[PDB]
Symmetry: C2
Subunit: 379 residues, 2 copies
């Protein structure tokens, strides 16, 4: 059931912006760990006296890393005379965000038909404004509303190159890394109370709700279900402490929990990422027991061959299944110091018409199946 | 002339501590870029609710990366009940340092015979105390005095494993990277006024002074000249703006300018580092013109063969010479967002007795020779 109730025309995820203390070191770590190339910059060398911003890309996936310079470099500026390339940026906000939450996502950016219209309609329907629409070089419009915690939903619209004022990066310093990642599949928030968070976001977007161990969750989706925004709340009083509650404690409240990155070839992506885990890249969660992969034959033996299932076992990949499609997924350990944000790598099999959004679900069946494999393997 | 006037027994450089916003991402970037392995940690997994600290090592070189957790995790603690492994750490100080200066060196740590004695004698001779001597697990004593800006000189002494409360890192997650770096050769500060900075530091240590383009400098040295602390001040009114003044502006005042890391094989180190510059590692300053390497034959043709000189040319290595020894050196681009701290890679030839400290000097002749090569090459 898809009522197609979007209150404005939404296209696709556009970019994710991390707020950092040092953008250079985070961007370089992420580039090597994920196989993303440096493609654009806005910093002192481009005339930006306010913030350092570096853009990594892999396919359609765009990760932006931003950190503030000393306010003294721009102390004579006012907003009419700013050298910032992202006019919503504020030194105090960025320092407060990072000191409160540590390294994490500040903005989930979606491309829309008209960012000024999206902003107006959103706030008319309950959105809390964060940054008003600003037109950049008569070419791009950007606006921001609060999503949850200190995370903003950023609207970007183009009349007709990331953003004005960004320069493309010299071909000596943009090595063409590529481990197969191609786009953002979904972006997940953790909140203390799911109900009020859903009502708020579905309230101002018109996004609809998409089709025992820690959490309750629900997924909001755009008209073609290509923008997917799951939200989790903790379940208290359980035997094992809710990882959602641990997040909220270490993050100082609500924020973005994980980014799921679609791979065109999850086996290649995981081979390449795992080669680099101990040499500057990302670590992965502990692999499931072999009983999990023994049990895969009964669950997805019609979708994956034996060789492809044992390849899942080598790489620690999880598998889950909808009534419509199949999902391969795996989770990294937290991206930074705090047990807060992590990354999911995903590939979806089925639902071909192009592939429809959310094919195979989000892997919620893997909570039960992981547990079952734990006990089964223990014997 | 070495008066051997140390007011307490100093051994060697012990470690350098960076204060970070996210220790994980900086440590992983540095590990890959410099070929240092993860060897110790103190963080949530070791019971530290206050700060995340990760130690990288290469030979005798020790780089420590530290960042604060949310104060809420340790809000019930007092100093008598702290879970911090570094008792001098303070959330407010660390956040203030990073917001003021960005990523940079907080502590230059030297091993001494008796850190409590070193502290007492230092402050009796004018040192500004920063953290009093604290004995850790009856095994290690640590104390801190102000060096310049917000950089501290840290004294560490051992009765008889980095620090108590640090755990050695699992052998799955400590890949044995090694590009040839072996120890810290010197650590350099930038100050607004050289005279008062020298008088202060030489005042409380008894370190002695060791043997047209931007700066004045002088070098303070311990008795055996193995702890070497150069200090620079800007020279104003010059044609090209002083890089020392640019540092002071972007850093919000005095601080550590560069760390010089001795390599047992600078050609191997630079081959390995340059292979990684565009895949998460460090960039190097622009190479000198070929006239620089043509002129090397007349200057050091008795020390380096033609093949070894052209190998210097491939890697962009600089060469300078004392009356006593020869120096090979090269400088990275800044380590983070701001044009502040950078790294020097160094190897010294000569002065064998073991090799005496500072053999060949610090390369000050390369200001003139670089310039000369610039004009000569222009024709
Ligand atoms: C994170 C996740 C998902 C997931 O992507 C997800 C969404 O995208 C939206 C709905 C709710 C949700 O959780 C699905 C299944 C999972 N199964 C297990 N674990 C897990 C494994 C090991 C140790 C701790 C935890 C997960 O984190 C996990
Ligand atoms: C940094 C440095 C040193 C150096 O280590 C050093 C000390 O260890 C103590 C004494 C003063 C001093 O500068 C020596 C020679 C150099 N020559 C050139 N440049 C340089 C090249 C290119 C673009 C800007 C600058 C340097 O940075 C440079
Ligand atoms: Co997910
Ligand atoms: Co030097």
């Amino acid at each position: 059931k898809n009522p197609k109730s979007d209150k404005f025309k939404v296209k696709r995820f556009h970019h994710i912006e991390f707020w950092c203390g040092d953008a250079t070191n985070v961007a370089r770590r992420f580039s090597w760990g994920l196989g993303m190339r440096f493609s654009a910059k806005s910093d002192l060398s481009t005339g930006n006296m306010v913030h350092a911003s570096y853009l990594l890309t892999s396919g359609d996936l765009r990760f932006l890393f931003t950190a503030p310079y000393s306010p003294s470099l721009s102390a004579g500026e006012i907003k009419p005379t700013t050298t910032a390339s992202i006019p919503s940026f504020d030194h105090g906000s960025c320092r407060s965000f990072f000191s409160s939450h540590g390294l994490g996502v500040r903005a989930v950016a979606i491309e829309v038909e008209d960012a000024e219209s999206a902003f107006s309609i959103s706030v008319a329907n309950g959105a809390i404004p964060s940054s008003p629409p600003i037109v950049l070089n008569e070419a791009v419009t950007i606006a921001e509303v609060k999503l949850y915690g200190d995370v903003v939903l950023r609207y970007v619209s183009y009349k007709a190159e990331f953003l004005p004022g960004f320069e493309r990066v010299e071909d000596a310093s943009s090595f063409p890394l590529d481990y197969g990642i191609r786009r953002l599949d979904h972006a997940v928030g953790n909140v203390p109370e799911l109900g009020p968070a859903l009502t708020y976001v579905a309230g101002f977007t018109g996004f609809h709700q998409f089709a025992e161990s820690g959490l309750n969750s629900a997924v909001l989706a755009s008209n073609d279900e290509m923008v997917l925004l799951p939200i989790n709340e903790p379940v208290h009083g359980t035997k094992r402490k809710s990882q959602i509650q641990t997040y909220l404690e270490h993050n100082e409240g609500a924020g973005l929990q994980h980014l799921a990155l679609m791979s065109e070839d999850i086996f290649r992506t995981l081979r390449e990422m795992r080669k680099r885990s101990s040499i500057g890249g990302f670590d992965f969660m502990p692999s499931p027991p072999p009983t999990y992969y023994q049990n895969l034959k009964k669950r997805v033996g019609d979708v994956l061959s034996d060789d492809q299932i044992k390849e899942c076992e080598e790489l620690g990949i999880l598998v889950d299944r909808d009534d419509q499609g199949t999902l391969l997924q795996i989770f990294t350990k937290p991206l930074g110091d705090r047990p807060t944000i992590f990354i999911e790598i995903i590939q979806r099999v089925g639902c071909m018409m192009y592939q429809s959004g959310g094919c195979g679900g989000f892997g919620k069946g893997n909570f039960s199946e992981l547990f079952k494999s734990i006990e089964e393997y223990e014997k």
